[PDB]
Symmetry: D4
């Protein structure tokens, strides 16, 4: 990757629906070269794909919760709990963090009831789980994970 | 929105690079009707846009940190700190949560040094900030915020 | 329920001993219509009943304690502990909360000894119980759960 | 108060809509004596009144939150914050507890938005307030504050 | 007990080596009446005895530690741990407290090594013990448990 | 101090009302030598005095509380708060501990009201005080500070 | 050890590569006496040896972590965990502390991956380990353990 | 640096008092080449020096404490506190850590009194300091910071 690829990615991270023309004109390079560079980035794994950005509100995903989960120590309990958490419907993020030394889980549901049935109740029945603390997000000030180039 | 729009969105959330043909054939509806429905979803704000999914690793974004921030109480301190946090380079997520009653900030940097210079040092100089706790993500088990329809 | 029912409920939540006359005169509606509306609210479950408000102090209920209880995770431990807590004499409130991710128990006793014998000792013998923290209420600034319409 | 008054109160705490007949027949005492005893209990302050029990769900009071509040120390800050908390619309309970050495606030709202506007935002602007932690009640296992005689 | 007994106790709590004369002259009552009152207080259990106040420093009791101990819940674990703690050499105080909902243990030792051998190591081997936190007293600002009448 | 003084102190710490005869007979030494040794211990400061042990229960000292107090840092705030705490009526113990890095205060009162008026309210008005946590002692398993020789 | 030995040690703790001449001239004593004193300090165990001070940065030891570890109570679990921790590659410090009543572990690794593989993963599989909290050192303000004489 | 330098450093980190002969014979390289390599490592900053390892016990450094320090946020308070901490006599380590988001300070003193006078009292008077928690090390299981090559 070179400076030019970065200029291309900086654009595609915001809007992937531009025409090779506009981009080429902005970056000041041959459209055939652009198309090539973009195809190379996809083959190399830099660009893993293209998604439609759906407004979670439009889907009534009003009950957002960030949950910290502590796993009991011993015989692979930690690694197994991570994958169990990632398969729960509504869970889009699972991170293991150093400090708290536990899992941070990001999930979205339409209501409290759905959250309890699909996430909370399920997580509570997991024996490996030592403890949890579910944080209710009452305000999304920002959420743009797509922006990787600042 | 109807059941059909959901089938369309469920596809576009994963791959927006399909052809109206394939989708139409899968959903079993006229391509002209599909194109219409999709254009309507965009005009209605359900589909806010289309992004390229860039692999953060490809950009050496190795230092990932989830930081909790406590703001001092009183005269609009809380709301102001939120926007200050969202403008920091490298910060893609800022949420205010109930329970901890503080801000949860998601950020990505190439190294510890960048993180300290762009995020930590800056956050420390903010007077409104009462306290913080930065969690180092040492493992991303899952991160698919684009998946809103399960 | 309409605006008129709300005016009726706003009154009955404070004093259910009024006469259909006074209320009718205040709300400015036929006494026969009032009686009907009230009977409908009872049949519909809005008005679950009428209670006498007894001053807890008059019963020497001097030892008030708000206890948080953490249940161990796994095989229905959580749901079972909740009902065990609600059957304890002196316990009038049991809530499961998100954040602390534990039960909050409200209880009233005449003395420390009664509290220990009827609540504390009993709760300690429950194996499902992971941990507890009992908060001693030394001052009731307000307690009007009957006021649901502000 | 004697054993007989307790039998009367034990009944009235559950249902104040009984007839002096039924109660008299159950307690086995003259209806004129009952009426007298009840009037005495009201004059003495044991029975502070009679309320209609309204099902909070019937009023869409779905967002229930138990909040702990820490007040800064010094010049009457503690006592003043207590009364400020009790005047907030939607707040039915305010207790000062020993141990946590802070205020426990019980509130009910129809939605997250109402809660934020009427409670959270208001509490955040109070300078005396050091810190808070709002617990989201996702399940009411029991709530019968009217039962003072077990 | 009357006002006079209190005046007697207020004196004896500070210095039990006074003569019945001095005390009688100070309290302004017959020495024979004093002797009687004091003998009555002993027979009644108010005065449980008379001790020599030994300066702990004179015995090289330099390592003072206040330890909080959490016992696991279930089958009489709590009550049993309390008595086990009270029999440890060097432990002069054991209290069960509400709030922390654990035992507070006061102990004194000549050195760190003695403390580790007689207290810490022993406490660690107790299975019922969930967790502990030992606070090192580096300054005794006051310690007059003998003063019960202020 | 020698082995013999220790045998004397071990006795006097439990009961200072023995006769020089009994003690001399038990220790197997001349009564004149005993009297001398004891007088020397008093002059040397080992024996600071003799107190009457009054049963706190006999004085209705039912509300026992162990309070941890955190002082703000800076200009002699710590040392000043310690002496302010030790002068509070009902407070018999004040220790500064390493770990929690705060003051531990032992106090006794007849009732909750007295505790609030004499201790809590007073402590809350102290500006230097950062935070506190008052632990309610609901059970004294042991309290023998007089026993310094085991 | 005398004042002169201290002057010698104060020098050798900083730089052990000086010549007996320079030191002798600085301390103002016969070189033969110096050599003797130094040999005595080594034989007596004061000087346990001489090491080369290697700059950790020069070895790419960029991932520094201070981890607190809580061991479960009971049958020698504590002492055994300590030695298990000290044998982990990359761990240079293991301390058992009073207060937190847990182990503090100092370790150094080249990267996050090495840290996870050699330390974290290994520690997680230890059953005796109750919980841990790994603190990421992002700045070494000072690290001179060799300086024992100030 | 190459594999050979590492073999040299691995030796010098343990014992810098070996002769170029022994080392050369062990590493199997010309003594003149060794001397050169070692001189290069010193000029390059890998080997910052050579110290005498003094047994802290030999200096009566019995009071070891690991203290966590929280600095108030705002105008360079954090960076300034770090250097203030590093200049305190007896302090050999100061680290700023991510997670706890505070300073970890390692210090050694002969007694509690010295610790209080040189460290604690001084740290308490620092206004920038928000809070601290000093952990008493009662057992050094391992302390070999000199070992950088495992
Ligand atoms: N930007 C453009 O469209 C130029 C294209 C270029 N001439 C080519 O060879 O494709
Ligand atoms: N799926 C298709 O391509 C059919 C298209 C449809 N016949 C139209 O009117 O556009
Ligand atoms: N408020 C009243 O009492 C009026 C009653 C009304 N006239 C009826 O039909 O009952
Ligand atoms: N229970 C009753 O109704 C009896 C009443 C009773 N005879 C009276 O004097 O009122
Ligand atoms: N205070 C005194 O010694 C008076 C004693 C009193 N006269 C008696 O009867 O013993
Ligand atoms: N124990 C005794 O009373 C002996 C006393 C001893 N003969 C003396 O000289 O006082
Ligand atoms: N400082 C010196 O080198 C003097 C040495 C001294 N004359 C001896 O006997 O070794
Ligand atoms: N290891 C040795 O001492 C050999 C030294 C080597 N011959 C030189 O040139 O110095
Ligand atoms: Mg996307
Ligand atoms: Mg009621
Ligand atoms: Mg005494
Ligand atoms: Mg060294």
């Amino acid at each position: 990757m070179d400076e030019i690829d970065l200029r291309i990615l900086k654009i595609l991270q915001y809007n992937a629906k531009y025409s090779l023309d506009e981009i080429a004109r902005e970056i000041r390079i041959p459209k055939s070269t652009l198309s090539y560079r973009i195809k190379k980035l996809e083959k190399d794994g830099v660009i893993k794909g293209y998604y439609a950005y759906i407004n979670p509100a439009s889907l009534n995903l009003d009950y957002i919760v960030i949950t910290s989960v502590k796993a009991k120590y011993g015989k692979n309990y930690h690694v197994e709990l991570g994958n169990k958490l990632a398969q729960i419907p509504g869970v889009w993020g699972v991170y293991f963090v150093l400090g708290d030394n536990d899992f941070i889980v990001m999930a979205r549901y339409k209501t409290r009831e759905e959250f309890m049935e699909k996430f909370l109740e399920r997580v509570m029945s997991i024996p490996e789980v030592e403890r949890t603390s579910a944080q209710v997000v009452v305000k999304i000030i920002k959420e743009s994970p797509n922006i990787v180039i600042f």
